[PDB]
Amino acid sequence: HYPTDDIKIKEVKELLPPIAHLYELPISKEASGLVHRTRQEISDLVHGRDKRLLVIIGPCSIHDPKAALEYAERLLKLRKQYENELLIVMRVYFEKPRTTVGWKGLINDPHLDGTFDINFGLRQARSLLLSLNNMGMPASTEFLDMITPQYYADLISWGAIGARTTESQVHRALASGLSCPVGFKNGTDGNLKIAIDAIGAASHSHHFLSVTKAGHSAIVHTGGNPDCHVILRGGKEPNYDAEHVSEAAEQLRAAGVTDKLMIDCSHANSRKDYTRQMEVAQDIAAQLEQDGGNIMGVMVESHLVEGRQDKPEVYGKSITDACIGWGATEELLALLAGANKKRMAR
Amino acid sequence: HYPTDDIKIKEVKELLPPIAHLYELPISKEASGLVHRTRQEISDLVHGRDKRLLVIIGPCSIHDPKAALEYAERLLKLRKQYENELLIVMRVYFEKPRTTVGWKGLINDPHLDGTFDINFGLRQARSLLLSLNNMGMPASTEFLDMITPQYYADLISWGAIGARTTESQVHRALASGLSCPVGFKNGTDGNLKIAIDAIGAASHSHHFLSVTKAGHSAIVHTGGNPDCHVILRGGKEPNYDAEHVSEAAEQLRAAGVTDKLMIDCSHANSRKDYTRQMEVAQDIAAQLEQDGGNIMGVMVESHLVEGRQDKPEVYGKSITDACIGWGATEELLALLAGANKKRMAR
Amino acid sequence: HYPTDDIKIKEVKELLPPIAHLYELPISKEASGLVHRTRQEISDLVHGRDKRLLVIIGPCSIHDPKAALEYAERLLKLRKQYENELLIVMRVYFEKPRTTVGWKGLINDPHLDGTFDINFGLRQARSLLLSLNNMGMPASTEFLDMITPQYYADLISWGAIGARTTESQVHRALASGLSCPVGFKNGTDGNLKIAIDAIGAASHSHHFLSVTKAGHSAIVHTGGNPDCHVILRGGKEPNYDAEHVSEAAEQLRAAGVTDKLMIDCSHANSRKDYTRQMEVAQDIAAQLEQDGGNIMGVMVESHLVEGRQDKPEVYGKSITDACIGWGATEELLALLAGANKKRMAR
Amino acid sequence: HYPTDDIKIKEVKELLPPIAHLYELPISKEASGLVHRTRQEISDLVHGRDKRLLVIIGPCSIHDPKAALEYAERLLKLRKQYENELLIVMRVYFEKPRVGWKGLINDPHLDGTFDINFGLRQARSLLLSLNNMGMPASTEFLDMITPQYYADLISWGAIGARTTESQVHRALASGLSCPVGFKNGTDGNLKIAIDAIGAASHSHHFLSVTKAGHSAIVHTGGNPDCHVILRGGKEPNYDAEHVSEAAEQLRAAGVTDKLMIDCSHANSRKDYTRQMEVAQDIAAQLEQDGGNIMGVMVESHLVEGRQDKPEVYGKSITDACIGWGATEELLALLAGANKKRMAR
Ligand SMILES: N[C@@H](Cc1ccccc1)C(=O)O
Ligand SMILES: N[C@@H](Cc1ccccc1)C(=O)O
Ligand SMILES: N[C@@H](Cc1ccccc1)C(=O)O
Ligand SMILES: N[C@@H](Cc1ccccc1)C(=O)O
Ligand SMILES: [Cl-]
Ligand SMILES: [Cl-]
Ligand SMILES: [Cl-]
Ligand SMILES: [Mn+2]
Ligand SMILES: [Mn+2]
Ligand SMILES: [Mn+2]
Ligand SMILES: [Mn+2]
């Protein structure tokens, strides 16, 4: 026999099943209530029943749980303070997806050394998400595959599908069965249609392969997800301004799906310059003051210390994309709370 | 206590593991040889060492294995006849990735009635692939997810990643560990960069989540795939002619990857008219007659009976994309063999 | 760091789960009916509601399925002929327990070569058992561990726990959850108390570890088995005669369990001499003629060809304990039918 | 379809696999060394290369981990004290194979809830803590699955009187990482235990699960470190005559003629106050000759006696045990007698 199986595989290793983590870290009654309620409050925004602004805000990536928890303490106070204008949810992303050289994130490589201790990574991820919900901070994350959600999606109040997978049929099928509302990014070249098609698709029932809670190969049958929306993240040019929002809203209505959308203040819309997220937020603030009816949320990349570093030396500073520091965070949130108070008052 | 888990899920159902199908339908010695040899022969085309034309030809999708086996019997004779000019490999795709409330393909719905019998579907897929190889017909397929490959990739001589997944980080990681050579399609809008980036990415080691042969949740560590190439499948306009082949070949060389490519005569290159595949094949033949040095392969949607039908009433006729029939298939293969015979003689 | 795990282990290999075999060889409607009815009819004998004689008869061990099935075809005629007097069930034991450098049975070694193809062995066992029930011949077997029953117990009408395991707590727990009636043998030196205690224990609920049908480590909670009885198989001294039956029945009643018992004509009661089976059976027929009210069944080791051999040269001749041949089998069965007819008519 | 599957089954429930417990409670470097070394030391006693007396001593069954650890803290001091004469290993048995409490793995809350995931975790956690403080552990393996959860923490294993003759339990012993003692039968029968040594030295196949919890076939290498345990039967078998008898038969079978004597169970006629009498007899044999004795078993707890409910702390709820004071005396007694033997 010539070999034909696993020719280009170095190793296949068993992971602990979801249920091993769920046994160690069950969702508490209070975390359950927060997640349940936060998903519902987000649905209300997606569907225009409430005019608060959803704000997904936090580090580009989580590389330190201690810092993430300190960040969440500071954020919670503003969450509460602005609760009538803003719905603040912490950004809890474990990786920056690069199909290239670079750290593969906290789940895949928690030790930051290339050892791929994924059992530890998943444990740490779940543990942080549970501690967050327990202190009263809801969590948001991006789902990159069809298996990881079984480990922690019970703790997630809002989920993202990235620009590179929005068109993927199987990722649309995943979104159709996510317990949380889901945002779809427009394409890497600014293509809106793939995200608009994604919202329609994810509303329907699908089948996809995954694993049971007990860790075994499975077929999953979804019910559909009515709570999906687009996320404007730039493309050929930035797409956050009134003209781009109006055009997207127009296309959304034509497709018969929600014309309420979210705008990334970071990444391509800021020209990959953290000091310009404020610029985008100010533009958004002005929209909310003039009208801004089609805006239901924004995303901001924020951390305890501004900027970036390429190794984790400075506490609370990003090792992936540069973030605004805490001072600028307070200023940006005050700005959007002020502006949206006026919108809501009409 | 509020519910937070599987809110939008109808059912999660354990499947028989890969080892069960592997036990019932082990790869034979002769099939092992055919797969091993065909992968190497395809590698030689991808890297420019052989000038035969890879021809990926057959149904848009397999909805009846009995008709697929008859097709293969006819195709085998031409595989043999043209073996000095063409390397013929049968198209064995189990579903057409569709955003439409329609048939989910042989794996998900093998009884064609909406019952979703996946154990039976995976068993049917493997059984067909084993019979194909045992008769002397190598098989090709598109891998839509990270789990199905564990059930039958050992029988696959060439694999596709489609236009909607070529940009996906996780599908690129899958390709980096597939035992077969892999073609990446250009984007649905015509974008070639996603496929060029995919070749580079898939050449390196990645990690991704999947299941073991025993069916347990697993982390997969790949070795990288040196046998990847692009597929021109059209965009806003078709991209099969000499000026598009030349532009694509410039871009491949500038990226430092193989500038040998495959052209799809169907889908957006035929603008969804099966009668135009022959016109595309004639343009390709003319290119091979004049020069055609960057062309290593073509794809063709072909069945026993031409056209398409919504229900599987006529035997050997597609229920997904419309295909050329057997007579036109003989003419098309005769044409490419004759033109490539000349290319090879220079 | 010193090693402590699996020091004396050569290999741990994954087995196909029970569900894989059940998938390929589901129990039929007719087999289901036969197994259900036969378990019922045997229960009737155990509890004195019917006075037919259970006869567990066939090869000491199955080493060839073709010959087992031919034996079954012959035995089936006699099962039908004598159905008003005898309840004939085929002996379908897969290994003989032996601490002596011996073939380890059809499940461990189905190729009869010292290879250990247990997937194939379990498949062969389930396949033979399904074929036997489908032809109208119910089947009996000995269960030696807590896992193998998951593969084929659904096809078993009567089960034994052997002399060497009757006192084992975990084997009694197994018997308490077996779907069939269970016979417990008296101990290897003739101890009866262990089998009497076993019946009492097995009537209660127990917990024991096993695997799920899907093949995963499991805790099993049993309901208790009310259809256990003892089997007299000899020891230091044979125990088949009237005086041994009467002392056994007295002890059974003193423990408040069924005083209906089975007598093995083979093994220690024949002194390993296959020609003594008929003399033991003649003694039992005499008991049935005079009274024999405590006898509900017998065991006989029988094959197409009498004797034994060390290698499987001759067709339908035992490679474990020596058996009686077919002609003697016909004689023995006509004997018991005639004698039990007189017992039943009283 | 008439039903034929699981007719007499209330439920079948998947368990957390061994890997889940291993992840939470990996064996430490220190525990690994202790286990590895203690198994070697025991092998040395089984084959007569060292003349220290193995002492398997502790509760009949473990129903409380708190009490077990306190017991182990006291026993450790005597383990060290008598280390040149005795090789002390703690008895850590989770069940008495009987109606009643099904033991610490099956019913860890002692209330009939049958929380087996909790049970196996508790068992493992207790075994790791013991080894981490320096007290090696022994246990009886009753089935073929439990060893995947904690056998890596076990320095000596038993197969009891009711399972010694079992083909499958012999097969298990043939793959156990620890030395294994086989008890004589409940009626006194020594032959089943002698045969078990021979069988267990050979390779076997038996069914079990992988560390990941999947149905598996286990191919063993054989266990060369098996021996018999004398535990009584019709009559107690601990005295000098019974020992010589047994030693001969071990020789006639070509297996190690060094053996263990249980001072409890049928040898004390189920009377915990007679264990000391049996130990005094063994002490006399050691003082005179006793060349064939490599070990003894003793059922000991913080507090003497037994009780039907777990009311008093450190008092057995299964077989009755000697208390701590008697344990001090008994160990002093055996150390002193074996010191003399080792001196000759
Ligand atoms: N458990 C996920 C859905 C899911 C099920 C199965 C596989 C993958 C995802 C949720 O609650 O959102
Ligand atoms: N078995 C696949 C590789 C693979 C392994 C694991 C998961 C997915 C894919 C092949 O031979 O191509
Ligand atoms: N399935 C067996 C009972 C059983 C269940 C689980 C483990 C072992 C045995 C029967 O029907 O008799
Ligand atoms: N893990 C056991 C051996 C074993 C393996 C598999 C099943 C049962 C037992 C040990 O180290 O002793
Ligand atoms: Cl993205
Ligand atoms: Cl983002
Ligand atoms: Cl396409
Ligand atoms: Mn970022
Ligand atoms: Mn198609
Ligand atoms: Mn026999
Ligand atoms: Mn005891």
Side-chain angles (χ1 to χ4, degrees), chain A residues 1-28 30-188 190-235 238-242 244-289 291-346, chain B residues 1-28 30-97 102-103 105-168 170-235 238-242 244-246 248-249 251-289 291-310 312 314-346, chain C residues 1-12 14-65 67-72 74-97 102-103 105-188 190-235 237-242 244-246 248-249 251-271 273-289 291-312 314-346, chain D residues 1-28 30-65 67-72 74-95 97-101 103-233 236-273 275-286 288-307 310 312-344:
Chain A
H1 275 82
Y2 278 119
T4 71
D5 179 39
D6 284 0
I7 302 315
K8 298 178 200 142
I9 299 299
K10 291 175 181 174
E11 178 172 40
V12 186
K13 206 190 325 196
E14 296 159 336
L15 298 187
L16 298 177
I19 196 92
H21 304 268
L22 290 158
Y23 183 86
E24 300 303 328
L25 296 165
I27 196 177
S28 62
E30 65 272 10
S32 291
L34 182 62
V35 171
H36 183 94
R37 176 174 70 89
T38 301
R39 292 162 174 179
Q40 185 48 248
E41 292 170 8
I42 297 176
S43 189
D44 292 346
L45 306 180
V46 165
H47 292 291
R49 301 187 283 264
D50 177 20
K51 285 279 157 187
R52 295 188 296 161
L53 189 65
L54 173 61
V55 181
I56 302 299
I57 186 163
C60 167
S61 65
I62 303 297
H63 70 278
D64 175 0
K66 178 176 178 283
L69 288 167
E70 184 171 339
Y71 180 90
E73 285 255 302
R74 296 189 195 188
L75 192 67
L76 181 65
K77 292 167 183 219
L78 305 182
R79 175 177 155 83
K80 167 51 71 159
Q81 189 183 323
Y82 297 133
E83 72 185 4
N84 302 122
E85 296 74 56
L86 313 177
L87 177 48
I88 290 162
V89 174
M90 186 165 165
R91 179 186 167 93
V92 194
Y93 284 37
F94 300 108
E95 122 187 60
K96 190 187 186 192
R98 331 184 205 73
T99 189
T100 76
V101 306
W103 174 62
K104 298 301 177 175
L106 193 73
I107 286 173
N108 298 322
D109 200 39
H111 308 313
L112 320 171
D113 58 13
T115 51
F116 295 88
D117 189 0
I118 183 157
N119 283 330
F120 189 88
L122 288 167
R123 179 55 51 79
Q124 262 207 323
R126 186 177 179 76
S127 186
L128 174 66
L129 290 168
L130 179 62
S131 303
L132 288 170
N133 283 287
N134 283 342
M135 77 163 65
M137 182 48 62
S140 66
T141 196
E142 181 175 48
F143 291 118
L144 305 165
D145 72 44
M146 274 56 62
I147 289 164
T148 56
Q150 290 288 59
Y151 292 84
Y152 53 82
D154 62 314
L155 300 173
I156 295 298
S157 295
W158 184 88
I161 295 296
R164 297 166 196 73
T165 48
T166 287
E167 206 180 359
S168 170
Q169 185 63 16
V170 67
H171 287 86
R172 290 174 177 184
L174 172 60
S176 78
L178 283 174
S179 299
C180 57
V182 170
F184 290 106
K185 297 197 144 211
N186 71 68
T188 47
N191 177 300
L192 199 35
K193 172 183 152 49
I194 61 165
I196 295 170
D197 294 352
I199 294 161
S203 69
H204 294 108
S205 162
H206 295 257
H207 287 258
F208 65 96
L209 299 201
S210 194
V211 301
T212 62
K213 289 306 194 300
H216 311 306
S217 174
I219 182 72
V220 179
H221 186 15
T222 77
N225 190 344
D227 297 324
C228 304
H229 62 84
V230 302
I231 295 166
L232 301 184
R233 45 83 72 197
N239 57 10
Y240 58 80
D241 75 11
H244 285 81
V245 171
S246 169
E247 229 294 318
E250 180 162 83
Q251 292 182 38
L252 286 158
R253 287 192 294 277
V257 306
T258 186
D259 68 350
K260 306 305 192 281
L261 53 72
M262 176 183 288
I263 302 178
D264 188 5
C265 296
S266 208
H267 306 109
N269 278 339
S270 71
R271 340 299 204 274
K272 304 165 179 194
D273 178 348
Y274 76 95
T275 64
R276 293 228 226 173
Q277 301 187 64
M278 182 67 173
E279 197 180 289
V280 180
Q282 287 166 325
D283 192 277
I284 290 159
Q287 291 182 62
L288 297 164
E289 270 147 0
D291 167 15
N294 298 106
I295 300 164
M296 57 68 60
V298 304
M299 319 185 75
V300 174
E301 291 190 306
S302 161
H303 219 326
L304 301 172
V305 173
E306 70 176 6
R308 56 187 263 238
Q309 60 188 338
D310 82 5
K311 280 215 166 310
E313 299 178 346
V314 178
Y315 178 74
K317 191 172 167 168
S318 176
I319 63 175
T320 47
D321 299 327
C323 294
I324 55 168
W326 190 250
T329 304
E330 284 174 300
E331 187 182 354
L332 184 155
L333 292 173
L335 170 80
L336 297 175
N340 198 53
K341 177 176 300 213
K342 293 161 193 180
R343 186 177 72 164
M344 289 182 80
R346 278 176 265 181
Chain B
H1 220 120
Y2 292 88
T4 57
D5 175 41
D6 290 353
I7 303 304
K8 291 176 212 154
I9 294 300
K10 293 171 177 168
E11 198 181 33
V12 180
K13 192 187 191 200
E14 189 172 340
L15 299 174
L16 302 176
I19 49 167
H21 305 270
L22 286 161
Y23 172 89
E24 307 308 324
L25 296 165
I27 191 170
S28 65
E30 62 279 17
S32 284
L34 185 68
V35 166
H36 179 90
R37 155 163 95 78
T38 306
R39 290 164 172 180
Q40 187 64 63
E41 293 167 19
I42 289 171
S43 179
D44 295 349
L45 307 178
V46 170
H47 298 293
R49 305 190 280 262
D50 180 25
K51 283 281 165 192
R52 296 187 298 160
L53 198 73
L54 178 55
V55 183
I56 300 298
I57 179 166
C60 167
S61 63
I62 300 297
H63 75 272
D64 173 6
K66 174 167 171 298
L69 290 167
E70 169 58 16
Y71 180 93
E73 288 258 30
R74 306 192 180 193
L75 184 69
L76 180 63
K77 295 162 151 253
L78 294 190
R79 182 174 148 80
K80 170 57 69 172
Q81 183 177 337
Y82 298 135
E83 73 186 354
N84 306 112
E85 294 76 58
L86 318 172
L87 174 51
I88 287 163
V89 176
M90 182 172 169
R91 196 184 147 96
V92 194
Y93 284 42
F94 298 111
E95 88 174 270
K96 180 201 66 187
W103 176 58
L106 195 73
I107 290 170
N108 292 301
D109 200 35
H111 310 311
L112 316 176
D113 60 10
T115 56
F116 302 102
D117 186 0
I118 176 128
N119 283 326
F120 187 98
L122 285 168
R123 163 76 75 243
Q124 281 280 82
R126 179 167 187 90
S127 181
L128 174 61
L129 287 170
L130 179 57
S131 299
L132 282 173
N133 287 286
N134 284 336
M135 85 164 68
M137 183 51 67
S140 58
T141 203
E142 173 177 17
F143 295 109
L144 294 163
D145 70 38
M146 275 54 66
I147 292 168
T148 59
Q150 286 289 63
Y151 289 83
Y152 55 82
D154 60 313
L155 303 159
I156 297 296
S157 294
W158 184 89
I161 300 295
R164 302 168 190 74
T165 41
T166 283
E167 202 178 12
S168 166
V170 69
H171 292 80
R172 291 174 174 184
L174 171 66
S176 76
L178 284 174
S179 292
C180 56
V182 165
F184 294 101
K185 292 190 136 174
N186 70 71
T188 50
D189 61 341
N191 176 297
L192 192 51
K193 173 182 161 54
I194 65 162
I196 296 175
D197 287 352
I199 293 167
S203 71
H204 295 103
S205 180
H206 296 265
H207 287 81
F208 69 88
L209 302 201
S210 195
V211 302
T212 61
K213 290 308 199 287
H216 197 89
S217 47
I219 180 67
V220 178
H221 182 190
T222 74
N225 192 343
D227 297 317
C228 300
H229 61 86
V230 305
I231 305 166
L232 305 178
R233 43 82 64 197
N239 58 7
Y240 63 79
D241 67 26
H244 286 84
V245 168
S246 175
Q251 289 175 35
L252 292 154
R253 284 192 296 277
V257 301
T258 181
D259 67 354
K260 304 304 191 284
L261 51 71
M262 170 186 284
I263 302 165
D264 189 354
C265 298
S266 210
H267 302 109
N269 273 331
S270 67
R271 294 173 155 121
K272 306 190 264 103
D273 181 347
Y274 78 90
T275 64
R276 290 169 188 153
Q277 297 187 77
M278 189 60 188
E279 195 182 37
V280 178
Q282 289 162 325
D283 188 282
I284 292 169
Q287 292 178 57
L288 294 173
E289 272 155 19
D291 175 357
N294 298 107
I295 297 168
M296 57 67 58
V298 304
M299 312 191 17
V300 173
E301 288 194 303
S302 160
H303 221 319
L304 299 178
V305 174
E306 71 182 4
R308 71 164 310 273
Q309 50 179 359
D310 293 306
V314 178
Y315 180 76
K317 187 171 171 182
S318 177
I319 62 172
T320 51
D321 297 333
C323 294
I324 58 170
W326 185 251
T329 299
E330 295 176 324
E331 287 169 53
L332 186 157
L333 288 175
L335 167 73
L336 294 171
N340 203 46
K341 196 177 161 75
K342 292 167 203 192
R343 187 182 61 160
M344 292 179 68
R346 288 201 285 275
Chain C
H1 221 283
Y2 287 88
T4 64
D5 173 48
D6 282 1
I7 302 301
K8 291 175 209 146
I9 298 296
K10 301 192 171 161
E11 193 163 23
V12 183
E14 328 191 294
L15 292 190
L16 298 182
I19 193 76
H21 302 264
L22 293 164
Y23 185 71
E24 292 301 328
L25 293 172
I27 194 177
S28 65
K29 176 143 179 295
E30 296 78 7
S32 283
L34 184 66
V35 171
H36 178 91
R37 166 167 86 83
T38 304
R39 291 167 169 178
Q40 235 198 305
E41 289 170 7
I42 292 176
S43 166
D44 293 341
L45 307 180
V46 169
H47 296 291
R49 291 186 290 263
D50 178 28
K51 285 278 154 195
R52 294 188 295 159
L53 189 70
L54 179 58
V55 183
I56 301 306
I57 182 164
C60 164
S61 55
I62 305 309
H63 67 279
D64 172 30
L69 286 164
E70 190 183 335
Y71 177 92
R74 291 194 202 187
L75 188 70
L76 179 60
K77 298 175 162 55
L78 297 187
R79 174 183 155 75
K80 169 58 57 171
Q81 194 184 316
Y82 300 128
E83 70 183 358
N84 304 118
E85 295 78 42
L86 310 176
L87 177 50
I88 284 161
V89 175
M90 185 175 172
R91 192 184 155 93
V92 186
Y93 284 47
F94 297 116
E95 104 178 73
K96 162 144 211 198
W103 163 60
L106 192 79
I107 286 163
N108 297 310
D109 215 63
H111 308 310
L112 318 181
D113 60 11
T115 38
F116 270 90
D117 192 356
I118 292 178
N119 285 322
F120 183 96
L122 288 170
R123 179 59 55 83
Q124 288 290 100
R126 180 172 185 76
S127 186
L128 175 60
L129 288 170
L130 178 54
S131 297
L132 288 169
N133 284 286
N134 282 344
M135 88 167 64
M137 178 55 58
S140 65
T141 197
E142 168 178 15
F143 292 111
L144 296 164
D145 73 48
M146 277 58 61
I147 291 177
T148 61
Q150 285 291 61
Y151 291 81
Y152 52 84
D154 62 305
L155 297 173
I156 292 296
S157 289
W158 183 89
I161 298 297
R164 288 172 260 283
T165 40
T166 285
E167 206 181 4
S168 161
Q169 181 65 193
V170 63
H171 289 86
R172 286 171 177 186
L174 171 65
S176 76
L178 279 177
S179 287
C180 53
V182 172
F184 286 103
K185 287 181 152 178
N186 75 64
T188 44
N191 190 301
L192 193 44
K193 171 172 161 63
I194 64 167
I196 296 180
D197 295 339
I199 289 177
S203 75
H204 298 110
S205 180
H206 296 261
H207 286 253
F208 68 89
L209 303 195
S210 195
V211 296
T212 59
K213 287 316 195 290
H216 315 304
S217 30
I219 180 72
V220 179
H221 189 189
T222 75
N225 193 337
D227 303 322
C228 301
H229 61 85
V230 304
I231 305 164
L232 305 181
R233 44 85 64 197
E237 162 191 46
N239 63 4
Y240 58 83
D241 64 11
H244 282 80
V245 167
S246 187
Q251 289 186 53
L252 287 157
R253 286 186 301 272
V257 294
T258 179
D259 66 355
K260 303 293 196 303
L261 55 72
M262 175 178 283
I263 300 163
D264 192 355
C265 298
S266 206
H267 306 101
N269 282 327
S270 80
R271 289 87 71 206
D273 179 10
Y274 82 79
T275 64
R276 288 318 84 162
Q277 295 193 72
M278 184 65 183
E279 143 183 306
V280 175
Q282 276 160 355
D283 188 286
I284 290 156
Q287 293 178 53
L288 292 172
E289 264 149 4
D291 173 19
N294 299 97
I295 303 173
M296 55 70 63
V298 297
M299 310 194 35
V300 174
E301 288 187 307
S302 155
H303 223 139
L304 299 172
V305 170
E306 76 181 17
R308 67 173 304 286
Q309 48 187 355
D310 290 312
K311 312 249 138 145
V314 181
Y315 176 75
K317 166 169 186 167
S318 180
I319 67 157
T320 45
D321 294 328
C323 305
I324 56 171
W326 187 252
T329 297
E330 285 172 317
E331 289 187 21
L332 187 148
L333 288 175
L335 178 62
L336 288 176
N340 202 45
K341 193 185 283 208
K342 282 168 213 177
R343 187 183 66 158
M344 291 182 72
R346 255 150 37 206
Chain D
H1 276 59
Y2 284 87
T4 62
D5 178 47
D6 286 357
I7 306 301
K8 304 179 198 151
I9 298 298
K10 290 178 173 172
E11 68 156 19
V12 181
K13 199 178 181 220
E14 190 177 340
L15 298 175
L16 292 179
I19 45 172
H21 301 267
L22 287 161
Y23 179 90
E24 296 306 318
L25 295 162
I27 185 176
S28 54
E30 294 66 23
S32 290
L34 182 68
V35 169
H36 181 97
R37 175 172 104 262
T38 305
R39 292 165 169 178
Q40 187 61 57
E41 287 169 13
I42 293 174
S43 175
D44 293 348
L45 304 176
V46 173
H47 296 295
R49 304 190 285 267
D50 175 27
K51 280 281 165 178
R52 293 190 298 165
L53 193 75
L54 176 63
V55 186
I56 302 298
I57 183 162
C60 174
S61 62
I62 298 296
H63 75 273
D64 173 18
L69 290 155
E70 179 171 3
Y71 181 91
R74 304 182 185 189
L75 185 64
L76 182 67
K77 296 170 184 250
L78 304 181
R79 170 175 157 82
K80 172 58 61 165
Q81 189 179 340
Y82 295 125
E83 71 182 359
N84 305 121
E85 286 72 53
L86 307 184
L87 174 37
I88 291 169
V89 179
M90 182 167 168
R91 197 182 146 98
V92 195
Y93 284 43
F94 303 108
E95 186 182 346
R98 85 301 242 125
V99 281
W101 175 57
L104 198 75
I105 289 158
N106 295 306
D107 206 26
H109 314 299
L110 315 170
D111 65 9
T113 49
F114 311 113
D115 186 0
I116 174 143
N117 282 324
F118 190 94
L120 292 158
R121 178 61 52 80
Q122 266 224 308
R124 187 172 182 79
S125 180
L126 174 61
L127 293 163
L128 183 51
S129 297
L130 289 171
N131 281 290
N132 282 338
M133 79 164 68
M135 176 55 58
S138 63
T139 201
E140 172 174 16
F141 292 106
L142 295 162
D143 72 38
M144 278 55 71
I145 288 158
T146 56
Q148 290 287 59
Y149 289 85
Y150 54 84
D152 59 311
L153 298 163
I154 298 295
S155 293
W156 181 90
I159 298 296
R162 296 168 189 76
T163 46
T164 288
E165 200 181 6
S166 168
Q167 177 178 251
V168 70
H169 289 84
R170 285 164 177 197
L172 169 70
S174 82
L176 287 180
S177 296
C178 54
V180 164
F182 285 108
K183 284 183 155 174
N184 74 66
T186 52
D187 67 333
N189 182 305
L190 187 38
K191 181 159 137 58
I192 66 162
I194 296 173
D195 293 349
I197 291 167
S201 74
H202 297 128
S203 183
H204 291 256
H205 285 68
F206 64 94
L207 302 196
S208 190
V209 298
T210 64
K211 291 303 202 296
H214 195 94
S215 42
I217 178 64
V218 185
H219 188 183
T220 73
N223 195 339
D225 298 321
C226 300
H227 64 91
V228 305
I229 306 159
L230 304 177
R231 45 85 59 200
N237 59 6
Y238 61 79
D239 76 11
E241 294 104 49
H242 284 90
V243 169
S244 173
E245 197 170 14
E248 187 166 11
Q249 290 181 50
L250 291 156
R251 283 194 288 280
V255 295
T256 177
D257 72 339
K258 304 311 192 295
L259 52 72
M260 175 177 285
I261 302 172
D262 194 352
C263 301
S264 205
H265 304 101
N267 274 341
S268 62
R269 301 159 179 281
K270 302 169 175 177
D271 178 337
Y272 78 92
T273 61
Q275 292 194 70
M276 181 68 75
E277 283 186 57
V278 175
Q280 287 170 327
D281 198 88
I282 291 165
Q285 290 175 60
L286 292 175
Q288 271 291 334
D289 173 359
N292 291 104
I293 307 179
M294 53 70 75
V296 311
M297 302 193 20
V298 177
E299 291 191 298
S300 155
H301 219 324
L302 292 169
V303 182
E304 83 192 357
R306 64 166 310 280
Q307 60 184 341
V312 177
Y313 168 85
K315 176 161 172 174
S316 174
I317 58 164
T318 48
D319 295 335
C321 297
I322 60 171
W324 185 252
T327 300
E328 291 172 321
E329 294 179 62
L330 187 148
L331 291 168
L333 178 74
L334 292 169
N338 201 42
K339 170 184 275 227
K340 292 170 192 189
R341 187 173 72 145
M342 291 185 71
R344 285 196 284 278

